[PDB]
Amino acid sequence: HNASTARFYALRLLPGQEVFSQLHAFVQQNQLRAAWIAGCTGSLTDVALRYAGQEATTSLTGTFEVISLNGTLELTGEHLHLAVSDPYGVMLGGHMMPGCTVRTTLELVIGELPALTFSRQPCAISGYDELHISSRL
Amino acid sequence: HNASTARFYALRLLPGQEVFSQLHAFVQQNQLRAAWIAGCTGSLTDVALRYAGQEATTSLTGTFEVISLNGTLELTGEHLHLAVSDPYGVMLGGHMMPGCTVRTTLELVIGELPALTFSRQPCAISGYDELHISSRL
Amino acid sequence: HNASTARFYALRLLPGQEVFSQLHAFVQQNQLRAAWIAGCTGSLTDVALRYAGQEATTSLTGTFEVISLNGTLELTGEHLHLAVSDPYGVMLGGHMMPGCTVRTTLELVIGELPALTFSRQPCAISGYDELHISSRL
Secondary structure, three states: OEEEEEEEEEEEOOOOHHHHHHHHHHHHHOOOOOOOEEEEEEEEEEEEEEEEOOOOEEEEEEEEEEEEEEEEEOOOOOEEEEEEEEEEEEEEEEEEEEOOOEEEEEEEEEEEEEEEEEEEOOOOOOOOEEEEEOOOO | EEOOOOEEEEEEEEEOOEEEHHHHHHHHOOOOOOOEEEEEEEEEEEEHHHHHHHOOOEEEOOOOOEEEEEEEEEOOOOEEEEEEEEOOEEEEEEEEEEEOOEEEEEEEEEEEOEEEEEEEEOOOOOOEEEEEEEOOO | OEOOOOOOOEEEEOOOOOOHHHHHHHHHOOOOEEEEEEEEEEEEEEEEEEOOOOOOOOEEEOOOOOEEEEEEEEOOOEEEEEEEEOOOOOOEEEEOOOEEEEEEEEEEEEEEEEOOOEEEEOOOOOOOOOEEEOOOO
16 A cells, blocks of 8 residues: 555754765665655755756855745665745746755754655656555564 | 644646646545645646636736746635736736636645644625634544 | 644635634644644735835735745744735745635644644844744653
């Protein structure tokens, strides 16, 4: 039924740290196999996003607040989306890429589903490696 | 105290599937009585949103990334909000309506609160059927 | 490892209620020490946001839908971000401040991490009081 209890972790990233690398380090340290971002708040200086249907990554630098950071992650993969707001309330969003740097802080609550395992397997329909959910066993 | 442990489900919707119908099918299959979207990431082609205070639904078609999908759902009701971003980072958001179609994928982590039951009961204050939380018992 | 199980609460705020005060009342009533917004949907009339890097709070009044409300909260502190959409799909976001009032409803699922305790301690790096996570014990 792809059901499972959940174990949660709370963490705070520091100024200057790059988000993707830190999330991967956390996933590795705790050997998370089926995790997702359950909650997130903070700020960024550098932002790296890949807009819908775009192949290239867009790099931005400024004063940004993280409005939402959603998605799944595991030992060998992830799929995260980010939305940020600037000093005038304007928001931008897309597929989060490596390169986002913490401004003052990034608070996160990450959930792990012990009974499941996430992997990225080729989907003949979309043509990309998509989320595959199987029992941890 | 309206407190409860939570059971989580992970799922992936496929290209071409309509979100509301699939969420309802999942709710029905597992007989979820007090669920909420704990995490979500993906993409859409068709988007159906009802903007703030509007009576009519706005239908859009294009290349969109799902930035956030939040809300509650249960056997006989739901209340979900969606935010999407286009190929240029521009975002749009509102009350999600039936009609949103998956582009490449939609990854979801849904939580269910076994000790509670969600229902929609008339609120003399707002004038609409609002979320009512009671013990599962 | 800053890990913990989670206990969840579901609640609905009423028309006219101010969000910060109600969240604090809920935190106080249940003596929550390490909580976060796990899910949220609803509408607002008055919106109080502090944009990225800004010192002053921006006050708005109108017809808004809550697209996302994220962040942590505890007995003596909180850090929440809000994103809202107007009658034309336009979104605005920032650091949520006291002053946001419910329009028709605000549905929330709040998680509490029993094994942890959140506090705000001075960070010599950012220069502000930041999230500090310690064991509940």
